[PDB]
Amino acid sequence: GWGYGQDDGPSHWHKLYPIAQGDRQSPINIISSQAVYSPSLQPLELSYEACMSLSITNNGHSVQVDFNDSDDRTVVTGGPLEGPYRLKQFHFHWGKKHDVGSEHTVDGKSFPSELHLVHWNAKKYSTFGEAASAPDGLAVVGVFLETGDEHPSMNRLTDALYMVRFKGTKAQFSCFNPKSLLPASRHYWTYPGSLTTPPLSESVTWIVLREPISISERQMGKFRSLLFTSEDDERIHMVNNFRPPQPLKGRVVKASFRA
Ligand SMILES: NS(=O)(=O)c1ccc(C(=O)N2CCC(c3ccccc3)CC2)cc1
Ligand SMILES: [Zn+2]
C-alpha cells in the first residue's frame, strides 16, 4: 500500500491517510534554541533486560527487532511519561549517504540514521495495536546514529542482516540488550507527535535523545545492503526509508537540558 519509493513515498501518504496533515505529526525539525528547558521533568530511565529480544525481521520497510512484552521488565519511564511503557520493538531509518537518513533533524541537520525504540502503555491498553491509536498509547525513544568509529555491540546486529536482506524474512535474535545501542547520556527533547509510518496516528510521546551513538561506515553499509524487495523481484535496496520533518503547528518542544 505505502512505501518509500517514488510512487508510494512519504510525499504521497496524505492522499491515503488524511491524518498526515494533522496537528501533531512526526518527525519534526528540532530548533535547539527554541526548545523549552523543563527542569520539572522527571529523570528518563531506560530499564532494559538483557534477554527479552525475540527475532530480527525485514518487513519491507525496515529491519525490526521484536521483544517479549508480556511483562514490565523492559520499559521506559520518567521524563515526560507518567508511567512505564513496555518495549515492543526497535527499528531503523537510514539514507543512501551520510547527509540523509534520520527522520528528526536538529537545527536543519540530518544524521545518516535514526534508531526508534517503540514502547506502549500496557497499563492503560490491552494490546500494542489498541495503544497505537490512542493519544497516550505510545512512547518512542529516538536515537541518532552518526558514522565514524565501529560500534562493538552493533556488530551482532549488522552481522545478522545478511540473513534478512530480503523482504519478508526473519531470524531468531536472542539475548540482544537494546541498552547496548544507547549513548552515555540520557538528555533529550520531548514533544507530542505521531507514528512516522501509516496510519500516522497521533499517539506518540516522542523522546529524542540529544547524544547520538556512532557506528562505522562499514556497519552503516550493512543496512544499505538490505532490500525493499523479495528474493524473486528485482533487487531494490532499502535506503531513504524515512519521512521528512512535518509542521510544528505551535507544539512546544521541551528539553531536559540547556543548549
Ligand atoms: N517510526 S515509529 O513511529 O517509531 C513506528 C512505531 C510503530 C510502528 C509499528 O509497530 N508498526 C506496525 C503496526 C502499524 C499499525 C498500527 C496501528 C494500526 C494499524 C497498523 C504501525 C506500524 C512503526 C513505526
Ligand atoms: Zn521509526
DSSP 178-203: GGGGS-S---EEEEEE--SSTT--S-
What the block records as the C-alpha cell of 206 is 516522542
Q: How far is CA 138 from CA 108, 177, 248, 255, 259, in A?
A: 26, 21, 19, 19, 27
Single out the residue of 137, 214, 164, 139 nearest to residue 59, CA to CA. Answer: 164
Q: Which of 216, 139, 151 is nearest to 184 (CA)?
A: 151
Q: Does the annotation mark 61 as catalytic?
A: yes
Domains of the chain: residue spans and CATH: 1-259 (3.10.200.10)
Cis status, amide bond into 199, omega within 30 of 0: yes
**Which string of DSSP letters, residue by residue, matches 116-134?**
EEEEE-TTT-SSHHHHTTS
Using what technique was this structure determined? Answer: X-ray
93 belongs to an annotated ligand binding site:
yes
Residue nearest to atom 4 of ligand 1 (CA): 116
DSSP 237: B
User: Among all ligands shown, which has an atom nearest to the Cα of 207?
Assistant: 1
Give how far Cα 126 sits from Cα of 34, 106, 131, 149, 200, Å. 37, 35, 8, 41, 20
Neighbours of ion ligand 2 (CB under 5 A): 116
What is residue 101's three-state secondary structure?
Answer: coil
Nearest-CA neighbor of 65 among 194, 170, 165? 170
In contact, 12 and 231? CB cutoff 8 Å: no
Dihedral, CA atoms, 126, 129, 133, 135, nearest 10 degrees? 50
Number of residues that this document lists for the chain: 259
Q: Is residue 132 within 6 Å of ligand 1 at its C-beta?
A: yes
Q: Which of 12, 61, 98, 237 is catalytic?
A: 61
